[PDB]
Design a protein around this ligand. Structure first.
Ligand SMILES: Fc1ccc(-c2cn3ccnc3nn2)cc1F
Ligand SMILES: Fc1ccc(-c2cn3ccnc3nn2)cc1F
Length: 330
């Protein structure tokens, strides 16, 4: 089997991406944030604290004939950006782009943090990291991908995020028309439950490539590119007037700037992030100071190849017995 779903930026700056997901019988379609950095499928629901729902589409398990309460199961997750949610668990039929899993744990939110409430466009998350991170207690649950894997034509999914445009998540097959050149595969460590790999270095603009190991995770659920402070300082040094702002919370640059590209290494291959990909617009409405899409990972504790990096590539999440990552230009 296979699945293919379009993923769509939630706004004009690609601050996140949503992908429609069918849950229950009859189908309840919710727009979920596909997150290779977490491992919980959770949704706004009829159980969510009413004051914490503001525009989101909710899952109502009582209206699904295939929904079943997973007795005694609860979940609670906190994300790196400070956001959180918690609730109870159902199993139900979940379909993504034609690919169907029965008995998928659908984690129903009873509580969500303000950032989720204030995001009317995101109805929940669909985690695509390794199931070892799943927070359901007392019985850990499998991700959508884990459940689907055996049935897929190939135990893979691919992320093809668009720049200011829709893209695609595929399950079970590699669309050889969706990238240029070849896919370069690189080793993955699952020891922290992430799609963790080691980049072979970087370049700023037309600069020389710096060969250096950068361990990090491929995370569709993180918007920006977070890299070591050395690397990040070298990037923003090439932008006149760019500086790190403690008050804003990262590197900002004059909105009048033309940003240089940023290249990262995958083995001997190179993915080039165009400068435009690195502009996340005014820090506040009307400001001439813009927020940078490359930021320091110092204080996060891990380097994160988020959407800014991933959207420059066709990315293969190979869930074979020994997982790997593949990157191609496109
Ligand atoms: F510079 C940034 C711009 C947008 C986001 C951002 C992250 N999100 C996660 C779900 N919805 C989100 N919306 N926005 C983060 C940045 F650090
Ligand atoms: F602004 C931030 C953006 C991302 C993370 C963050 C940490 N993570 C650990 C594994 N997955 C993660 N995803 N995200 C933290 C931030 F403070």
């Amino acid at each position: 089997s296979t699945g293919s779903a379009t993923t769509t930026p939630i706004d004009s700056l690609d601050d996140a991406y949503i992908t429609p997901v069918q849950i229950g019988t009859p189908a309840q379609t919710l727009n979920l944030d596909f997150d290779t950095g977490s491992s919980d499928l959770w949704v706004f629901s009829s159980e969510t604290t009413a004051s914490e729902v503001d525009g989101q589409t909710i899952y109502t398990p009582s209206k699904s004939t295939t929904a079943k309460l997973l007795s005694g199961a609860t979940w609670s997750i906190s994300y790196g950006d400070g956001s959180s949610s918690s609730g109870d668990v159902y199993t139900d039929t979940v379909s993504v782009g034609g690919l169907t899993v029965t008995g998928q744990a659908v984690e129903s939110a009873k509580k969500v943090s303000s950032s989720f409430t204030e995001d009317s466009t995101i109805d929940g998350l669909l985690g695509l990291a390794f199931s070892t991170l799943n927070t359901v207690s007392p019985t850990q649950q499998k991700t959508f991908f884990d459940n689907a894997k055996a049935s897929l034509d190939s135990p893979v999914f691919t992320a093809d995020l668009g720049y200011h445009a829709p893209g695609t998540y595929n399950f079970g097959f590699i669309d050889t028309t969706a990238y240029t050149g070849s896919i370069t595969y690189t080793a993955v460590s699952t020891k922290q439950g992430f799609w963790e790999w080691t980049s072979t270095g970087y370049a700023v603009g037309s600069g020389t490539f710096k060969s250096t190991s950068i361990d990090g995770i491929a995370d569709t659920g993180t918007t920006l590119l977070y890299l070591p402070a050395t690397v990040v300082s070298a990037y923003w040094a090439q932008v006149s007037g760019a500086k790190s702002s403690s008050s804003v919370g990262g590197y900002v640059f004059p909105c009048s700037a033309t940003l240089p590209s940023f290249t990262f290494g995958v083995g001997s291959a190179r993915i080039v992030i165009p400068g435009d990909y690195i502009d996340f617009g005014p820090i506040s409405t009307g400001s001439s100071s813009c927020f940078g899409g490359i930021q320091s990972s110092a204080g996060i504790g891990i380097n994160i190849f988020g959407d800014v990096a991933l959207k420059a590539a066709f990315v293969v999440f190979n869930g074979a017995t020994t997982p790997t990552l593949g990157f191609a230009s496109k």
